[PDB]
């Protein structure tokens, strides 16, 4: 979950060791399309997306990609406009990678507001990856180009929560929307 | 299969942990079975986990290569695209008729209610899990399934 409005967070990575020895999931969201590829990406110590600013983005998050057994481009995926809190639920069970999303306007201070906001299903595709680690991809936008070297110019606000198997009691409204829930545990 | 031996198939004889359903492990690392850290080379405590097959036509039935095809489909009630060679009829209204939208057979009356279904929702069930509302696959209107007299 995050409340930024400058398109900083626009992708994530998933994998076990985040190297070329094992498979890794690369999901990047652009301004007009989304790229999802499963390949042996050699993730560096500090993966980030480069920009030559407006266009011509460079994927400096990996060093090599050879196998590349699965690719997916949907271009409807996660931006939900630019005008605030976009919540996401990532699930990987039985080899299927489930993604949920929801756009909720924020009219409060810099904190998680009360109420309920159910997330809608987004995509369900099989990757068959033993995902144990992940990292958020963010565009630096340091007004100029930057090499593949890690620890770039960070000088020039997202929440992370872990899911657990829990039993819930969902209450549906008259219009079919979920307005309340109860965590039994 | 080849009479001289087809070595284009592996089966990962050894692995550190049991694999989960619907996963793929194509790692070619050396399986470290001993305590000494294996440096990527074959040794007395770490060998190659990927073993090759000895497919030869001289072997009897049971050791020959058998191609296995697993068709994993989802029959859950949801907006689908593959719906066989089943053809379509017209849409009658306010009468006791049969309905077969996506394999869901039964008998009821269509009323064209005002239920607001989401794009990922096509079927609606009641307390008894009986489908009382469906989304037409062709037309984006919502139709309720009410039992007849």
């Amino acid at each position: 979950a995050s409340t930024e409005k400058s398109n900083i967070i626009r992708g994530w990575i998933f994998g076990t060791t985040l190297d070329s020895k094992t498979q890794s999931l690369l999901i990047v969201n652009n301004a007009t399309n989304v790229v999802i590829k499963v390949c042996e990406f050699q993730f560096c110590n500090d993966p980030f997306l480069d920009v030559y600013q407006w266009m011509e983005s460079e994927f400096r998050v990996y060093s090599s990609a050879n196998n590349c057994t699965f690719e997916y481009v949907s271009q409807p995926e996660g931006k939900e406009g630019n005008f605030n809190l976009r919540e996401f639920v990532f699930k990987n069970i039985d080899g299927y990678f489930k993604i949920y999303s929801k756009h909720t306007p924020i009219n409060l201070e810099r904190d998680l507001p009360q109420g309920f906001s159910a997330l809608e299903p987004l995509v369900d595709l099989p990757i068959g990856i033993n995902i144990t680690r992940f990292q958020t991809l963010l565009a630096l936008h340091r007004s100029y180009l930057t090499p593949v070297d890690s620890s770039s110019g960070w000088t020039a606000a997202y929440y992370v929560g872990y899911l657990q198997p829990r039993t819930f009691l969902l209450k549906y409204n008259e219009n079919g929307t979920i307005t309340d829930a109860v965590d039994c545990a | 299969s080849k009479p001289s031996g087809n070595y284009n198939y592996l089966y990962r004889l050894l692995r550190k942990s049991k694999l989960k359903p619907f996963e793929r492990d194509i790692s070619t690392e050396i399986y470290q079975a001993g305590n000494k850290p294996c440096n990527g080379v074959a040794g007395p405590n770490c060998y190659s986990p990927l073993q090759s097959y000895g497919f030869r036509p001289t072997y009897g039935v049971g050791h020959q290569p058998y191609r296995v095809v697993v068709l994993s489909f989802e029959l859950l009630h949801a907006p689908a695209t593959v719906c066989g060679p089943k053809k379509s009829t017209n849409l009658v209204k306010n009468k006791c008729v049969n309905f077969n939208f996506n394999g869901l057979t039964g008998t009821g009356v269509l009323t064209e209610s005002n239920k607001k279904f989401l794009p990922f929702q096509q079927f609606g069930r009641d307390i008894a899990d009986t489908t009382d509302a469906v989304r037409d696959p062709q037309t984006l209107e919502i139709l309720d399934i009410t039992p007849c007299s």
């Binding site: 979950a1 919540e87 639920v89 949920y100 929801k102 904190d111 998680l112 009360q114 109420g115 309920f116 906001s117 159910a118 997330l119 809608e120 299903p121 929440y159 929560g161 899911l163 819930f168 969902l170 979920i178 829930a181 | 859950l76 009630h77 949801a78 907006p79 990922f120 929702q121 096509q122 079927f123 609606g124 069930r125």
Partner: peptide, 18 residues
């Protein structure tokens, strides 16, 4: 860099498509 907060009543999603 890192802070700790609590989610009061958020994190719910539609389990099925019914």
């Amino acid at each position: 860099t890192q802070s700790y907060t609590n989610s009061f009543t958020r994190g719910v999603y539609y389990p099925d498509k019914v």
